[PDB]
C-alpha cells in the first residue's frame, strides 16, 4: 500500500539531512529558548514560530518508557513518563518543554502511525515504517504540513504521557462505531482548525442561539475557529409564537460578536476567528450589509466627540478657575461672562447640555478636572472594542437568481422566515450597490456564490451547503469540521524539473494521514463528531505556487502560469481522491456515501471533464468551470498525469465510492506556510524582490528575494550577469564603486580619514543621507536642508541606486524584456517601480484553480485605493463569471486605523 | 386550620361586592377590549393593568368540563375544554380570551386550593372552601396580591386546559421528593418573578459564563429577572492554567449585558431585570464601579461627535460642490481653496483624517453626500444601545472591615481570585471615594451590606447570601427564587381602627398560598428545583403604608408613623413564621432545616429580641437593629401583637422547625401595586396631594388626593372645612366665586356673551391664561406679552391659587401648624410649595422595618440635584449605622437623558 519514493530503509529517520540549534526570542521595546534544533536549511522565522507556538512548552517527561500493546508493532507504542527514573533526577527538570523539531515531527507521525495500524490502513508492517518514515522526512524538508493544532496537540498523549480530564467532547469508536464522550483531553488529538456550525431560530434549546455562543466559545478556547450562516434566525419584527415579535438578527449578532471579542483564541494574543454569512432574501439584510459600516461611522464620532468634550472642558474649567470671587458666582454662567463664553463655545461643538451641567455641578463641590479618556481611530483603541461587528468576518451568500436580478434591474423580494410571506421589495440594483459600496468602504460583506457552492456538493441529500469557515475556504455541510494540510509546491522542483512522481506520492500519503486524523480526533460537539464520522471530509491543499512559478522561469499574469496551476491542482486533488477510493475499497465507504453516490460521481465526473479539457458536458453546473488549458501548460506530463489520475480517480470510485466526501482545499497558510518557509502563501504570488530576512542575530537584513537569482538561472541567463541584476536591486552598500559619487570625487573635498566612517554607515541601506554627525569637517545647520551642495540631486539619487538598490528588475541591466512580467508582484516594487498584477490576475488563477477543487480558495484580493465602487462589484462579478465559489475585497487604505 | 373572618358561607364566592365593565385602550399618538369586568371599586389603571397585561388574551376555551378527580372534592376539580360543546359553535368564537376579574380570580385560587388540596395543606375539605372563598374576596377587593407571574401563569392550566411542550424545566415531585424534568409548560405554574443564580469561574461549562447567559436567557423569555454575585470570575490578567491569561471579568459582564438588551422580557417593550454585584476586593472592582461612568461618557462623545461629523461633511461636500471646474480639481485640497478651508475646520474639529479622505473618495466617484446618522441624547437613541452596562442594575457589596477600613483611612487589598495573593493595594477612601462619585454621576452602583445580609442569615451551613434579586429584596443562596405577594396595608383600616386580626389573618392565609406556590411550581434549573423545593423561601410583602399613615393621620417623618410601620412590619413576619412553623409541624420542615436549627432560630430570636423593644442581647448580629419602639407607637394593642405572634413564632419553631427558610420581603410593587390601587408603593411615601386619574373616557382628571380628605376626616375637622382646604388645593375651576378677578370685575370691561365661555374653558386649569381667541373684542397681538392688562401680575396669580389650585396644603385655611407635617410628600407638591421629606425620613423607616424582614427592602433614594458626593456617602453610611441591607441612590436630573 505505502512504498518509499523520498526515504531509505537503513537512514530512514532522517536519511541524510543536517541540524543546528538557534536561540529564539522575542522582547518588547518576554519569550527565551536558548537552544531550538531544528534541520539546517529553516529560517529564523521558522525557527521562532516552530518554538513559539509549535513547541509543547511544559510537562514534557524528561524519561520516557514506551507501553507494549499487544499487536501493534514495535516502534509504534505509546510512551508515559518513567517515574522510576525520573526519580533519580531533581523535580526541576522532571518535567520539560520540547527543545528540538524532531521531537514534534516524532510525535505527530508516531501518532498518525499508531492510529493508522490499529485503524488497519496499512496492510503490511512495512508500509508503516516507510509511512512512519516519509511523513518526518516531507515534514523536515518543508514539504508539507498540517494545520496548525495538529502541530501543538497530537502525539502529545502517545509519544510523551500528557493526559488531563475534558469535558464536552465526543467521538465516534472506530472500532464499533458508537458515539462516545472523550473523557481523555490528548488521547484522541483535537486536529481540525475551524468548523462550520449550524444555528436553529431558537433561543435557549440545544443549536439555538444562546448555546451556539456556548459553542463558539468551547472552540475559541482551544484556538478553532467557526462559521455559521445566521439567516435562519426570524428577522426583527417578525411575530413570535408566544405573542410579541422578535428582537431580530442584528441583536443576536451583537451578542456573538460581543462574546467573541472578550475570548483569547487559545489564550493567546490571538484574535477569534469568525465567520458570520447572511442570505440576500433575509429581511434585516440591509442592516447586515451596513452593519461595520455604520459602526465605523461611530467609532470616528467616538473620538472626535470624546476629544471635543476633553478640549471644551478643559475651556470650561479655565474659565471658572479664572474668576474673580466664589465658587458660587465662578460657575454661575451669568455672573461669569468668560464662563459663558466656553458654554457658547461647547453648546455649538454639540457638546450636550447635560454634561455641560455636570462639570458645573462637580465644580462647585471643589473639582479641578474630571477624568475623561479620549480614543484614537488607531488598531488599539477602545472605540474599536467599543463599538459592534468588529469580532467577524461578515459575508453574504448570492444565489444565480440575485445575480439574474441585478442584470434584469428586476425586484427582490425579501421574504420572512416564519411563513414565508414578502416582507420587502426593494431593487435588486440597489441592495447590489450597497454591497459595493460597503465592501469599498470597510472589508466586508465578503461574498460566496451559494450556486456555484452546491453544483459541486458531493452530498445534498443531507442538506444544502449554507456556510464556511473563517477564511472562506472549507465548504460542506453544518457542523461538520475543517481538516487541513498543505504541501510546499516549490520541494518537488530540482533543477528544471518538477518531481512530479514525487508530488503524486506526496499527495497519496497526506490524504492517508489526513482520513487517519478523521479517525484519531475528539470532537467539540455530539453531532459534528457523528458527521465527521460518517462523511470524513479532508482538506489538503498547497502553497507557494507564487514562489514556484518565479523559480521555474513564469509569470504569475501568464497563461503558461495559469495552466499549470490547473494541472497541479487536477493533479492532486485526482490522487486524493483516487487514494480514498482505494481506502474505500480496503475499509469501506463513509457511512453518507451510499445514499448520495449519484451526485458525488456526478461532480467527480464534472472534474474529470475539466481535466480533459471539455467546453461543455457539465451535468448540473451553474456555471461551468475553467476546463485544463492543454496547450500553454509549460509540461506535457503533468496535463497527461492530471487526466490518468482523474480518469482511474472516477473507475474506483464507481468500483468502490470514497472514504472521504471532501478531500482538497486551498487555506491562506498564513502560519503554516511561514514553519515551511514558503516564499508565497496558499495561492497567493509574491510581494516583493527584496525582502528583510530575520536572521539568527535577531536582526533584519536586506537580502534578494531567492526566487529572483533562480529564476535568473531557470531561463537563458549566466552567473556573470545575474549577480549583475541582483546588485541592481539589492545595491552595492558601498561608494567604492559607485560611479556617481565616486570615492575619487569625495576626496576632491576635504574627504580622507572619513570614508570607512561612511562606507558601512552606508549598509544600513535607508536611502542614504548618512552626511551627518562631522562637526569638524569645512563646514550651521539648518534642519533638513543641508543635502550636500555638490553633486546634482540626480547624482544623489543615481548614487542611492546603487549603494541601496532599486529594489525591482525594472532598469535593471541585462534582463529582456520578455522576461520582465515573469518578476511582477502583488505590490510595486521599490519606489519609482511601477508594474503590478491585476486585481484580474488574481481572480483568473483562482479560477483556474477553483475547477479541481473540492471546497473553496482563501482570498482577500488587494485592490488600489484609487478603486471605485463600480470596479468592485466588477470583481466581484467577474468572479461569478469563471466559477469561482467565494471571494474578499480590501481597498488599499479603506480602513479607519491606516496611517 | 383555615377559618372564615372575611366572607360568608352562602354567598361565599363573593359576599355582597358590586362589578361593573369598563372599555380599555391603548393607542399612539393598538390594542382595545370592549367589555373587561372588574369589581366596582376598581380604577381605570387598575382595569387597564388587569386587560392589558394580566388577562389570558388568547386560546381560552368558550365552553369548559371538569375532570373528576378521585380523592379531590368537588369545587377543585381541574377543567379541560368540551369539544362536544365547542363544536356546536363557530371555530371563530371557540377559543377566546378572559375578559372578567373573576376569571382570573377563580383561576388563581382556584390553582392554589387544588395543590394545595393535594399536598394536605388543609386538614378539612371545609377549611378549603373557606380558603378558596377567603382567597378570591381579599384579590377581589384589592387586599393582597401575588407577584405578577402568578396574575398570568398560575391557573391556567387547572381552569382552562391550556397546555404545551417544555423544554429545560424542572420540579421536585411533591410526593416522592424526586427530581423530575417537567413536560408540560403549563401543569406546573412558574410563579416566581425572579432569581439569585450562581457563577463559576468557567467559560463553558455548566454553572460557568457562557451557560449563564443561556441560564438568563431562559428566565428573560417568561418575563423573570435574574441577579448574580460575579466576583468568583477571576480578574484581568489573571492567570489561566493552560498557558495564557483572562481577559477579566469586564469582559465577560459585557457579554451578558448585551445578551440582556437583545431579549424582550416577555416578548413585551418591557426590558430585562438584571442585578449584577461584584465584592470591594475583586481586583477589577474600580473599572466596575466606574463601568456606567464611562459609559456615559462614551454616549456624550458617541452624539458631539456624530452631529460635528454631519456639520462638517456638509460644508465639505458644498466646498466640492461650489467649485468652478472638474470634478478631479474640485476634490484637491490644493487646487480647491474652500475646500481646503472645510478641511481645516474638520480637522481642527477632530474630524478623523482617514474619514476626511473618504468622503473625497466619495465626491470624485460623483457622489452628493452620504447617510451618516447622528445620535440623541433622549432614551431612544441608539448612542445608549451602543455603549454597555445600560441593561443591568450594578451593585457592590460592601463588608464592614471596608467601612472600618474607610473611617481609620487604611489601606484596601485587592486579592486575586486563582491563588488568593494580593493584586494591588489602595487607600479605601479613594475606592469609597469612586463609589460616591459614580453614584452620583449616574444611579450605580448601588450598595449591600454582606455582613448585615448574612447576620440575619438562617442556612449559613449551605453557603453565605452573595447575592440578590434584580430590586435588592431578596436575599437568599445562590440558584434559589423570590416568591412574593404583598398586602395593600390600606385595606385594613375601617373608621379610626385597623383590622388587626384580620391583617394577622391575611398573613397567615398567605404565608400559606405563598407555602403552596413553592409546592407547585416548575423551575429553570434543576439546582434551583431542588434548592427551592429544600429550603422553600417566601417573599410575602405589603404596600400602601405611605398611604395608610396619611390615612390614618400620621406624618412620615413622624416617629410615631415610623413605630406604627416597624409593628406592622413586626407583626406581618412573626405570624408567617408562626404560620409556617405550624406547617411543619404537620407537613415538616423544610429539609435544609434540620442542619441548620441552630441558625435559623438565632435569627428567629434576634427578630423577638427587637419586637420587645430590646437595646442590646443580639446574638451575632454586627449592627443591631432598631428595636420596636414601645411608646411612640399609635396603638399599644399592635406592640403587644408584635410581641405576642413573636413569643410563639419562636415557641413552635422550637417546637418543629419551620416550613421555610424565609417569610417575608417587601418589593417595589411596581405593577401589582397599580392593580390593588395602592395609594403609594411598597414602602415608599406619597408623591403629591393633587393626582390626575385616568377614568373610564381615557382623559386624564385633575383630583384630590383620596388620603388628604381621609386625612382630614380622621383628625378633628369637620365635613364644611375639608371641602374648604381641597378647594383651596385643587381649585375651584371658575372665576364665579374668585375674589381678585371675578365675573363684576370681568364686565367691568366688555364682557358679558364672553364669560361662559372663559369659565369651562378655564377646567383644563392649566395655570390659566385661557383670554387668547376673541378678535373682535375691544382690542395687534404681539407673541406672549399680551398678559392681560389691568390685574396686577398678583391678582393673576391671585385667581390662578383660585382656579387652578395650590396643589399643596401648605397656606390652606383651617389648617393647624402642627397637622401640615401630615402631609409631606416626597416631592414638593404645587409651584411654591416647599416641603418634602428628608432623604433621613426614608432611611429610617426602612430600618425601623429591616429589623422585622427576612430579606431586604426594594429601595432607590431620590435625592436632590443639588446633592454632593459627600452627602451620597453619606446616605450610604447612614443606611449601614441602621442595620439596613442594602440601598440605591438616584439624584434628581442625573442622568444624560433628562431634559
Ligand atoms: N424575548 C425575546 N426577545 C427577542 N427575540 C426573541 C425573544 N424570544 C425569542 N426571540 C427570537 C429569537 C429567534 O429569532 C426566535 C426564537 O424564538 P424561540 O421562541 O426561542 O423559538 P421557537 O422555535 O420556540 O419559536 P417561537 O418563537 O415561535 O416560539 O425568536
Ligand atoms: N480564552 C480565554 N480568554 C479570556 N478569558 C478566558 C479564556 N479562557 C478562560 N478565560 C477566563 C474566564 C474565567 O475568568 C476563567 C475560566 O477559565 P476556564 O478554563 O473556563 O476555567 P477552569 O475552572 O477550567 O480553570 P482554568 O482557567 O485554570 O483552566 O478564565
Ligand atoms: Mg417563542
Ligand atoms: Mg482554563
Redesign the pocket.
Known sequence: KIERKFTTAEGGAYGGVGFTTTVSEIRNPVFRNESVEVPEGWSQVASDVLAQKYFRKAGVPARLKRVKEKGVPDFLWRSVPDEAELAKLPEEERFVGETSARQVFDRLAGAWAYWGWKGGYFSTEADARAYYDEMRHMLARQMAAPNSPQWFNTGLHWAYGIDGPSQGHFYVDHATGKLQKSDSAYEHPQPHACFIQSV??????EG??MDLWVREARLFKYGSGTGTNFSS??GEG?????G??????M??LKIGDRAAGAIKSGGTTRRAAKMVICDMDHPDIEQFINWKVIEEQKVASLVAGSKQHEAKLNDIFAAIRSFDGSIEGATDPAGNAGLKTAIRAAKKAMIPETYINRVLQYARQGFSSIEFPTYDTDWDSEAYTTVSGQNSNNSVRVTDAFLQAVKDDADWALVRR?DGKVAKTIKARELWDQVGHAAWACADPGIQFHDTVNAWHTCPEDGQIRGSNPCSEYMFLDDTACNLASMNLLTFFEAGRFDAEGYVHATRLWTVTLEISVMMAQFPSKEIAQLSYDFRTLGLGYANIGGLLMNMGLGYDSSEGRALCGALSAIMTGVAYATSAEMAGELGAFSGYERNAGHMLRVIRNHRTAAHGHTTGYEGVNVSPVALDQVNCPDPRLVALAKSSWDEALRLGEAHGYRNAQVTVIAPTGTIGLVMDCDTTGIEPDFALVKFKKLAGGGYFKIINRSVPAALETLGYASAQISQIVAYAVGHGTLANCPTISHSALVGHGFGAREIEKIEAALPSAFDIRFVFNQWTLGDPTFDLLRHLGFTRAQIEAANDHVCGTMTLEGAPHLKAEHLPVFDCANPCGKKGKRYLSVESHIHMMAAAQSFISGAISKTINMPNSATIAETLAAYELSHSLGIKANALYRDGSKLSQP
Open positions: 436553529q431560530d431558537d433561543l435557549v434549546n439555538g442561539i434566525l426570524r417578525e411575530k413570535l409564537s408566544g410579541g415579535k422578535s428582537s431580530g438578527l441583536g443576536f416564519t
